Structure formats: C-alpha cells, structure tokens
UniProtKB/Swiss-Prot annotation, chain A:
Changing residue 68 to A: Increases redox potential, reacts faster to NADH and forms two-fold longer-lived CTC. Its cofactor is FAD. Monomer (oxidized form). Homodimer (reduced form). Upon reduction with NADH, undergoes dimerization and forms tight, long-lived FADH2-NAD charge transfer complexes (CTC) resistant to oxidation. Also dimerizes with isoform 3 preventing its release from mitochondria. Interacts with XIAP/BIRC4. Interacts (via N-terminus) with EIF3G (via C-terminus). Interacts with PRELID1. Interacts with CHCHD4; the interaction increases in presence of NADH. NAD(+) 2 binds at residues 68, 365, 413. The gene is Aifm1. Its EC number is 1.6.99.-. FAD binds at residues 10-14, 36-37, 44, 49, 105, 157, 310, 326-327, 355. It comes from Mus musculus (Mouse). This is Apoptosis-inducing factor 1, mitochondrial. Residues 6-355 are annotated as: FAD-dependent oxidoreductase.
Length: 442, 442
C-alpha cells in the first residue's frame, strides 16, 4: 500500500461508518482503513452488556449476541469476507474497502498529503478521516503503586479487556469497580447478574454522590443508585481513594474517608482521553475547553482532513461547540464525514443520541445537551420536578429556557419527538404540556 | 435573482486583496465585491497620518499622498476604470471585477449558497469571502449623555470621518482625543503638527499610564508618550472619564480622581468591534476569546465560505489562534483566501506585520505576538540592555523562552530577518547575539 484515494485512521466505529457511507456515495471507491488494533472493526456496547447477559458458554469465543429485536448477530461490523486486502485494493475493479490491522499512523504530513506508519512505510492520500477515538484514563492512585498492584488492575475498552475480565469473574471473591460513569455502572450491573449465579462479591465506588451523577439530576442519580444496588452491587459513594497496596495477596484500598476495603481485582472507568497524538505532528488545533481535534460544523479540519467519533470536537449549529463519546454519534459523524469527503458539504444537523441500561428497571434514551450541571425539569407518572417514585418519565435540560437536552426515562420509540423539540427550540411556557407528547402513560 | 462565481463581502482592504489574488490565479475569473460603504475600495493608514502631513489645500479632495519613499499615488486601491459594472460582469469576455457600492449583505443562506441584500435582491454564489472588518466602539460615557454632546463627538475610520475632522481642525481651540493605542496616538500626532501652524490645542487622554501601553513594555510606553507630547500634545494618562456635559457651548469632562477639562470636539479611538452580524443568520461560529468569525488555518469556515481581515480569527500553526486588526494582515489574509478559493489549500504561513509612526522620532515595524502582557527583552544603541535613552533598538517577546513576537524600534528593512527568527523559533540562549543580526548601529 503506497497511495490510496480515501484513507481512514482508526479501526473503529466511526471509521467503518464513514467507509460504508463513502462507498455508497461513490460506488467503486477505494477506501483504506488503518487500525493499530489488530482486531477488525467492531462495535463496543455489547462488551458492556449483551455479551454478559448471554446464555452460551461459547459466547466469549463466538462474540455473537442476541439483539433487542430478538435476532442474533456478531459484534464485528462485517465478516472478513466483505473487506479486501491492501494489495488487491488499487486493482480490484469497482473498488472495495481494506483494513490494515495492527499498524499505527504516527506522523501526519498534512501539506504533503501523506502519513508515516510505525513500520516506517508511507501512504499518500487524496482525502483523509481521523477516527482515532480515545484511550481510557488510568487512576493516578494506581499509577503511583507498583506492578504488584497493576498486575491485578485493568481498564476496559476492547475485546481483550472483556475476555480477561469475564475470566476473572469466575476466579475471585471480590471485584471492585471505580467510577460513576456509564461504564462503571454498566459493568457493575453486568456482574450483579453474575453475582446472582456465581455468588461473587461486586462493589462499585466513586467519589461522587450517586451513579451517573454528571448526566442525571441528583434525585434521579440516587434512585438509579438504588436500582443498581438491587441489581447486586455494594455501592459506596463519596469514596475519594487514598492509595492501593497488597494485604496478604489481596488488594487493599484506603480512603480519606478513613474506611478501607479488600478485594481481588480492580477496573477503572474514569473517563476517556481522546487520541490526539497526531495533532502536533500535523499542525492541527485542539479544542482546549472540550478536548479533541477542533473541527467545524462539517467535521472538517483542513482542506482534505476530517475528524469523527470520540476524537472530534465540532460546531453544532443548533447547540454550539461540543464533543461526543458515544456510539450512535460515532456512527452519525462517521457517515457524515464520508458524505463530506465525497463533496456533500453537509453540517451536523441530524442529531445523534445514546442509551444506557442498568438492570431491567433502568433503560433510557437521551439526546442533545444532557448535563446535570444545567437546570432540569423532570416529569413522571404516578432544578424542578412534577409527579417519591421516578420509574417512568422525561427530563428536560435548559439553556435560556430552551430545551437543549432531553432524557427519555423508561420511555421508548419516542425519540423522533424529542428530536423535533430540540430542533424547534421554542421557549416552551408549559413543560407539562410538552411532556404529554411523550405518551408517558401517566 | 442573479448569480456570481466569486462573491466578496465588504468593500475593504482584505476584499480587494483577495480579488486581485483570485484574478491572478484564474485569469478571466468573475469577481463581485459588495460594499455597504458607498466608497470604492481604499486603504486607511493615510487617514491616520500621510494625508495630514501633506503640503496642499486640495489634499482633502484629491486624496493623493506622496510617501513614504517619495512617489505619489491615490488611497483608492485603483481607479474606477479597472473595475467593471455588475451588469457587464457575467458577460464581459475574460472576466473582471465589479464593486457594488452602498449595498449591505444582510442575510447569509449558507446551505443555499446565497445572500440577500438590504434592497431585498438575491445573489447566489460559488465561493464566498467574508471581509467585513469591524466598526469602532463608542464610549459608554458618551452613550449616556444627550445629542447636545454627541453632535460634537466623532469616532473615525472612514474618509467621511477624516474630512469632517480636518475641517474641525480649522474651526476650534481645543480637540480632545481619547484612546491609549494606535489611532489615539497616531491622530494626536497629526494634530500636534497642525498645532505648530494653526496654534490649536490638542490633548490626548486615556485611563492607562502611557501610549501604546498594551503593545510596548511600560518603559518604552513612557519614552514614547514624551515623544508624542513634544509633537504638540497635552497627554493626560489615567484619564478615567466620568461623564460629559456642556459648559457654555463648550464640552466639559469630569474624571474619577476629580480632575476636569474643557474642549470643543472629541474623537474616540477605543477599539474596534468586528462585524459579525452575518453569523447568527448563517450559522457560523464566533471565537468568544478573541472575537470575530472562527476559521481554521486556511481562513476557511465552511465548505464554500472563507473569512479575512479584521473580521477573521484564525489558527496560526506557528503562534496559535489569534485575530489581527492591521493593514498588512488584511492584505495577506485577503490574498491568501483568494488563493484558497481557487483551490490552493495553503495555511497561514507567511507572517503579516504592521508599523506605526508617532512624529519623526518614533517609526517602527513589528511582527508576531506583540503584547506587553508577555515578558519582553529590549536591546538598544550606544529585562533590558541599552548597549535612560531608547531611540533605536529591537525588542523581543517571549513564550516559553521562544521568540514569538518582535518589535523593530527605529530600525528599517530588517523585517525578513525578524521573520526568520519568529519562524525558526529556537530557544535563543543569548538574545544580545540575536540582536546583532539587526544592525542596530547604522
Ligand atoms: C464497553 C463500552 C460500552 C459502550 N456502550 C455504549 C452505549 O451503550 N451507548 C453509547 O452511545 N456508546 C457506548 N460506548 C461508546 C462507543 O463505543 C464509542 O463512542 C465508539 O466506539 C467510538 O468510536 P470511534 O470510531 O470514535 O473510536 P474507537 O471505537 O475508539 O476506535 C478508534 C480505533 O482507532 C485506533 N487508533 C487510535 N489511534 C490510532 C492511530 N494513530 N492509527 C491507527 N489507529 C488508531 C484505536 O485503537 C481504535 O482501534 C461504549 C463504549 C464501550 C467501550
Ligand atoms: C485611519 C486608519 C489608519 C490605519 N493605519 C494603519 C497603519 O498605519 N498600519 C497598519 O498596520 N494598520 C493600519 N490600520 C488598520 C487597517 O487599515 C485595517 O485593519 C484594514 O483596513 C481592515 O481591512 P478589512 O478589509 O479587514 O476591513 P475594512 O477595511 O473595515 O473593510 C470592510 C468594509 O466593508 C464594508 N462592510 C462591512 N460589513 C458589511 C456587510 N455586512 N455587507 C457589505 N459590506 C460591509 C464596510 O464598509 C466595512 O468597513 C488603519 C486603519 C484606519 C481606519
Ligand atoms: N453510552 C453508554 O451507555 C456508554 C456505556 C459505556 C461506555 N460508554 C463510553 O465509553 C467511554 C468510557 O466510559 P467512562 O465510564 O470512562 O465514561 P464517563 O466519561 O462517564 O466516565 C466516568 C466519569 O467520571 C469522571 N472521573 C474523572 N476522574 C475520576 C475519578 N478519579 N473517580 C471517579 N470519577 C472520575 C470523568 O469525568 C468521567 O466522565 C466513555 O466515553 C463513555 O461515553 C458509553
Ligand atoms: N497599525 C496602525 O498603526 C493602525 C492605525 C490606525 C488604525 N489601526 C487599526 O484600526 C483600529 C483603530 O485603532 P484603535 O487605536 O481604536 O484600536 P486600539 O484597540 O489599538 O485602541 C483602543 C484601546 O483602548 C482601550 N479601550 C477599549 N475600550 C476602552 C474604553 N471604554 N475606555 C478607554 N479605553 C478603552 C483598549 O486597550 C483598546 O485596545 C484598530 O483595530 C487598529 O489596530 C491600526
């Protein structure tokens, strides 16, 4: 591989999305992906959920799962057979898509329209997408302790990290998870379900007051916390860790609080650092407020260079500048980039979204500026709230008395409406009136 | 309904620059400018100084000037005869450039690739440049007093504002200028030279401690202040104006400390608000840190939309994100945009610059990050190293012990060198050594 028309950087969700899009816009286009992950492109959400819930003892080899619709499919976006090899790519008639596993792009000659790989080799391109996502944070209290401790502490983002943990599930008494994040919460709840069978101890802790405390209003944060617990976790909020050593071949955690806890294995879901290493070498701007590559509303950075997924900080003409670490986003932005690389010139209009599930009694969808820092208004059946019990409802997020963000709590398929509301952006006088549009079944 | 290939918005310096550039890159291109000023495109720095120094009582009609090498020319970038009419433009063989005077562009349909004028009419375009510069600030203490006072208070940035003032020069005792910086000082010194003939009073005041105190180190700010004075101006630093009323048909100004001053006419040079009114309607981002339209290093905002001059906040790959209100910049950025509209894809590399002249004993050039807030090092003729008197030298501006900005104080033609230094951006160990590269002596 020496020169390719369409180069995508990163073997991830956004990259695939873009590639499918490009191919549809110019059939017989020639798209090369470049993944440092030696794994072919695959979706992540199952790792935190579906794979765990599976009734199959081959699950962790097949990596198939069963869908919300009921049907069964693989986490790979495609079987190896759809893709082609790099050697074949410039030659195979009517184009194709190559993925090139386990090579990192390490330098970006923007002006030369070219890149150097970690193996020294060089590819010149016509249009390029950066889709490098991010890489999870380590905790600095883990960074400080020695490899007698990091031997039994993992991070979670890839299949490797899953299989490893799924195994560790069937090998210890106690697994301790840190973070109020979706990942921390989503995982704890995966293990609470193993706890019901394997009788294993599961503990989530985090220095904040409740689960998802950063995206949900503090009341709902709590309610949720309870639901997690019941799912089967010992949830310890306000856990500002001190340090971690060993106590007879068993990890021990001290905290300013003064309490302390023994366990076997740790997982840290404490955010994600976007992968921006290519910026310096390319002469590309970073958004210092939000992190990640700075791009415009069309996801463009420079004449031939676009950015997408968790790596991309973009102007949302509607909601303003932001950056989004979520699946559906990475798909949208990917698809979008792909259009714009084929001359679409479309800005980010169709909004993206996300979901989470924490035991069967918490499943929600959401969209736009979802942030507990902002003033919210929750509306349920049977900083303001209307109609003890919050099992089903909808929550609004406001800037200047306009709905900038919506959460649909245990309400499903009503996304299209939420979209229309966010989009119209009226200054709704009566939110109770709006809430009826989401047939809450009050 | 009508349509032009290359549309430029604003009848200014940047717009012209771009148009000349475009025409050279695609001869027989068809470029339409759109000025809300009814005046054809013209350069401004003469109003500040060259036209006042002229030995002619027709000066203010011809608008010719005879500087700064000795040759004679007009402030219009060119004679009406080079440009063409709009009607002719789509038809005239081998293109041409039309200016369309006294129409404002008031709406921007980015997606539709079109604009509405204030007269309701509509132009669709293929590529567009925004070149709207800015509009000078009023003082809020003037805003509060009534049209008795505002009748005799101007702020000036256009020929209209010059002719008016040049007249007022030969009609009163006292003219009071307010503004610590460029235009403030540059005007005061125009009037000190009339003071030597017309025997008129001239007074500059401003709440800061010295002239140009924001771009020069505070010692040199002072030294400069003195030089102004001798030019013939009563300089009152720390003015801190309180309010303005009349005292027997003569304007009177009170100040926080307690002091007060009578005068006939006021001019306010207190900064410039960039013209961004098209952003909301177009869905274009504003840089809130620096002000103005946010663009990338290629001056591009969206697929077919570029920005330039004082309006444009851009990524300088070398020096970072910034925005610049200066002539040579507006020319560069204009030229550059024009290249990128014809597919150049060049980022902002060749640095831009500026100069100022405050009486014959202060004439300087400068480049890059010139800002007294930053640490500086001055080096003069025989931190600071003068081998009391600062008549000739060079001043360095530092971030992380790298030269990010340079001022050449009474040193001429040595710009190319300064460029090389800024550009190489070494961590120069001995600045005295660097200072020799500019032959301070002779
Ligand atoms: C366990 C889990 C559960 C999740 N659940 C949800 C959910 O329920 N809902 C939701 O909305 N979102 C969820 N997400 C988030 C979603 O998976 C991400 O937003 C998405 O994967 C990001 O895709 P991307 O293409 O931007 O980056 P990534 O998926 O990170 O792909 C980037 C790829 O590029 C590689 N790469 C990095 N640098 C280079 C380089 N220089 N050269 C070549 N390759 C490079 C990376 O190693 C990686 O292989 C979840 C994520 C995880 C991990
Ligand atoms: C008196 C004076 C002296 C100066 N001296 C110096 C100097 O000595 N050295 C130096 O480096 N710099 C100097 N400058 C700065 C320099 O002249 C300006 O920075 C430069 O002219 C800006 O060019 P521009 O093309 O960005 O905008 P402008 O020259 O402001 O041109 C834009 C114009 O286009 C029109 N316009 C605005 N909005 C719209 C719209 N919506 N639709 C249609 N038309 C519109 C308006 O007439 C507007 O003023 C001086 C400026 C002035 C005023
Ligand atoms: N959409 C989903 O349902 C879903 C599910 C799983 C993962 N993900 C994504 O995968 C990525 C990894 O997930 P994550 O859990 O890191 O998301 P997250 O970003 O919610 O992580 C938890 C949050 O805790 C904060 N934090 C920082 N330091 C901390 C500390 N020392 N202790 C406790 N909290 C700290 C971080 O701001 C972080 O945002 C994220 O981008 C997330 O968006 C999404
Ligand atoms: N290169 C040149 O020599 C030259 C000459 C003429 C004009 N210009 C450009 O045209 C514009 C006009 O010049 P200018 O002197 O007005 O700009 P300027 O910003 O240099 O001068 C005004 C300064 O006064 C201060 N100020 C702001 N608001 C104030 C207030 N309410 N009260 C008191 N002080 C206040 C600020 O420091 C501001 O920078 C500028 O953008 C300038 O860069 C440049």
């Amino acid at each position: 591989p020496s020169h390719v028309p369409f180069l995508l950087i990163g073997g991830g969700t956004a990259a695939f999305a873009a590639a499918r899009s490009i191919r549809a816009r110019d059939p017989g286009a020639r798209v090369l992906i470049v993944s440092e992950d030696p794994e072919l492109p695959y979706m992540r959400p199952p790792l935190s959920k579906e794979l765990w819930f599976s009734d199959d003892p081959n699950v962790t080899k097949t990596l198939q799962f069963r869908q919300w619709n009921g049907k069964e499919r693989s986490i790979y976006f495609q079987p190896p057979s759809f893709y082609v090899s790099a050697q074949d790519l410039p030659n195979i008639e009517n184009g194709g898509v190559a993925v090139l596993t386990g090579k990192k792009v390490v330098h970006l000659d923007v002006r030369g329209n070219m890149v150097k790989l970690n193996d020294g080799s060089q590819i010149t391109f016509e249009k390029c997408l950066i889709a490098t996502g991010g890489t999870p944070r380590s905790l600095s209290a883990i960074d400080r302790a020695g490899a007698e401790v990091k031997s039994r502490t993992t991070l979670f983002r890839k299949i490797g990290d899953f299989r490893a943990l799924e195994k560790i599930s069937r090998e210890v008494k106690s697994i301790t998870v840190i973070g109020e994040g979706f990942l921390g919460s989503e995982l704890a709840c995966a293990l609470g379900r193993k706890s019901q069978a394997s009788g294993i101890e599961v503990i989530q802790l985090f220095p904040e007051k409740g689960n998802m405390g950063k995206i949900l209003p503090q009341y709902l944060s709590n309610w949720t916390m309870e639901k997690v617990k019941r799912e089967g976790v010992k949830v310890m909020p306000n856990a500002i860790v001190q340090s971690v050593g060993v106590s007879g071949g068993r990890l021990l955690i001290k905290l300013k609080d003064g309490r302390k806890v023994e366990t076997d294995h740790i997982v840290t879901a404490v955010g994600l650092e976007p992968n921006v290493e290519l910026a310096k070498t390319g002469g590309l701007e970073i958004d210092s407020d939000f992190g990640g590559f700075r791009v415009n509303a069309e996801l463009q950075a420079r004449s031939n260079i676009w950015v997408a997924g968790d790596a991309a900080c973009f102007y949302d003409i509607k909601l303003g500048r932001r950056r989004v670490e979520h699946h559906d986003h990475a798909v949208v932005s990917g698809r979008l980039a792909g259009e714009n690389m084929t001359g679409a010139a479309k800005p980010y209009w169709h909004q993206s979204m996300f979901w989470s599930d924490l035991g069967p009694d918490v499943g929600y969808e959401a969209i736009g500026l979802v942030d507990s820092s902002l003033p919210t208004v929750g509306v349920f059946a049977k900083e303001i709230t209307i109609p003890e019990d919050y099992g089903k409802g909808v929550i609004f997020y406001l800037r200047d008395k306009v709905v900038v963000g919506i959460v649909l709590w245990n309400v499903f398929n009503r996304m299209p409406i939420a979209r229309k509301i966010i989009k119209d952006g009226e200054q709704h006088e009566d939110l109770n009136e709006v809430a009826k549009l989401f047939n809450i079944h009050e």
